Design a protein around this ligand. Structure first.
Ligand SMILES: CCCCNC(=O)c1ccc2c(c1)NC(=O)C[C@H](C)N2C(=O)c1ccccc1F
Ligand SMILES: C[S@@+](CC[C@H](N)C(=O)[O-])C[C@H]1O[C@@H](n2cnc3c(N)ncnc32)[C@H](O)[C@@H]1O
Ligand SMILES: [Zn+2]
Ligand SMILES: [Zn+2]
Ligand SMILES: [Zn+2]
Length: 427
């Protein structure tokens, strides 16, 4: 069709997107490649720099020796967007720049040297929100340091403003990046990358949204996850669902410079359940998760598992599985076990997440769709067919809404459903 969405000017939250026509759950609203993107710090050399797929088979750029790739095709295609950054990268090894700086380098190369980008159809990098009049002095110091890091990293390819676009202010561009960066997760919901998607950046936040985004490599799909009326603002949740209203407050302040007075934030919706169990215990668990989550972002599965087991099967006092810190521990342990092939133990943690995930991810949410598929997949390969089929159908009922036929993972689920169904049919 023409578009199901259009940019408009909201009353109190700058620009927004709104429905042009009524929308149903699962309808594809928009799709976009990035303006610019980069692999994350902790997944560097663990995933293809370009398609963001994992492998043990990864060849690597001998020029800079920082880029890794899954294929000759991926190395070659990533050359135009990695030609200019190439020199700068080698030229500063091994104190590597923060992701935000590498990301902005690619933005600049792309605005200088690229044709207009399809990702900027509804809204461009130039139009993005900076919140400059809301930034705290502490935030500004932080952005100054990013500007100086950028001028250093980029010295070879960029010495002055004629090499940057028309009047382009680097302080403002980092301001834009802070509140318009998308985290790119792979099919298994692990963080692998960071990109800008300027048309998608019109979406304002809601702690109970009507839309969802999902990624297939660097490609982004925006889908409705509820019914939406003509004229209704389109929204997505910018944050992890496993957070309390206080945690959301801090993050929405610090990164996005706004205050949320939605129903959930006004009522502290779910907050008491999330923090059930003994406070001294969940305090330490939340402390240890810093490290467990760091190890995870670096794919260090045996170490993740060791630390999770010391919590889950601790000799000292334990937490309910509905406690968010406990829950995040169980999830990391599950993922560790999957990636280490300890499938019975993976299933044990996975099944325990099921009921909390039902509660903390209401309606249709891609994170729940994927977790349910994962558990269903584990059961399937232990011959637990009736319980598998149950979970695979549930995953399909979520992911037909959240991922849809345009996302290749749905094809994988379809194969699992046909397999499980074969088994039952014959039994
Ligand atoms: C510019 C304003 C948008 C900021 N937000 C996002 O970029 C975003 C949020 C949540 C995401 C993703 C991206 N990425 C995905 O692949 C979808 C899944 C649902 N999702 C996560 O699970 C997630 C949860 C908390 C932290 C980071 C995460 F990636
Ligand atoms: C990705 S942008 C969203 C588009 C933005 N409103 C614009 O005008 O370009 C993120 C910024 O939008 C604003 N924003 C998003 N959700 C909001 C909300 N629920 N209430 C108020 N402001 C919000 C904040 O300025 C935030 O830093
Ligand atoms: Zn690749
Ligand atoms: Zn290179
Ligand atoms: Zn809220």
């Amino acid at each position: 069709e023409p578009l199901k969405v259009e940019k408009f000017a909201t009353a109190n939250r700058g620009n927004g997107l709104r429905a042009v026509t009524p929308l149903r759950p699962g309808e594809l609203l928009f799709r976009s490649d990035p303006l610019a993107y980069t692999v994350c710090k902790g997944s560097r050399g663990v995933v293809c720099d370009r398609c963001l797929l994992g492998k043990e088979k990864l060849m690597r750029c001998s020029q800079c020796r920082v880029a890794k790739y899954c294929s000759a095709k991926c190395q070659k295609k990533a050359w135009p967007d990695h030609k200019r950054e190439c020199k700068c990268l080698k030229s500063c090894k091994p104190r590597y720049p923060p992701d935000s700086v590498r990301l902005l380098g690619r933005v600049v190369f792309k605005l200088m040297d690229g044709a207009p980008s399809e990702s900027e159809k509804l809204y461009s990098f130039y139009d993005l929100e900076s919140n400059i009049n809301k930034l705290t002095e502490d935030r500004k110091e932080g952005l100054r340091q990013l500007v100086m890091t950028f001028q250093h990293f980029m010295r070879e390819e960029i010495q002055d403003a004629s090499q940057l676009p028309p009047a382009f202010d680097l302080f403002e561009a980092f301001a834009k990046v802070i509140c318009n960066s998308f985290t790119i997760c792979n099919a298994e919901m692990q963080e692998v990358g960071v990109g800008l998607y300027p048309s998608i950046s019109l979406l304002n936040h809601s702690c109970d949204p009507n839309c969802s985004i999902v990624f297939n490599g660097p490609h982004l799909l925006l889908r409705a996850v509820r019914d939406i009326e003509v004229g209704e603002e389109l929204t997505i949740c910018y944050l992890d669902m496993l957070m309390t209203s206080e945690e959301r407050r801090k993050q929405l302040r610090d990164q996005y410079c706004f205050e949320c007075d939605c129903f959930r934030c006004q009522t502290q919706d779910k907050d008491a359940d999330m923090l059930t169990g003994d406070e001294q215990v969940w305090k330490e668990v939340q402390e240890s998760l810093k490290k467990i989550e760091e190890l995870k972002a670096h794919w260090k599965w045996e170490q993740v598992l060791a630390m999770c087991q010391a919590i889950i099967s601790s000799n000292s006092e334990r937490l309910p599985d509905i406690n968010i810190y406990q829950l995040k521990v169980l999830d990391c342990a599950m993922d560790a076990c999957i990636n280490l092939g300890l499938l019975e133990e993976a299933l044990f943690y996975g099944t325990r997440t099921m009921e909390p995930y039902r509660i903390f991810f209401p309606g249709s949410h891609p994170v729940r769709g994927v977790q349910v598929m994962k558990v269903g997949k584990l059961q399937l390969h232990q011959g637990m067919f009736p319980q598998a089929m149950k979970n695979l159908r549930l995953a399909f009922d979520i992911m037909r809404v959240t991922h849809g036929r345009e996302h290749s993972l749905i094809e994988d689920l379809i194969l699992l459903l046909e397999e499980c169904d074969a088994n039952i049919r014959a039994s």
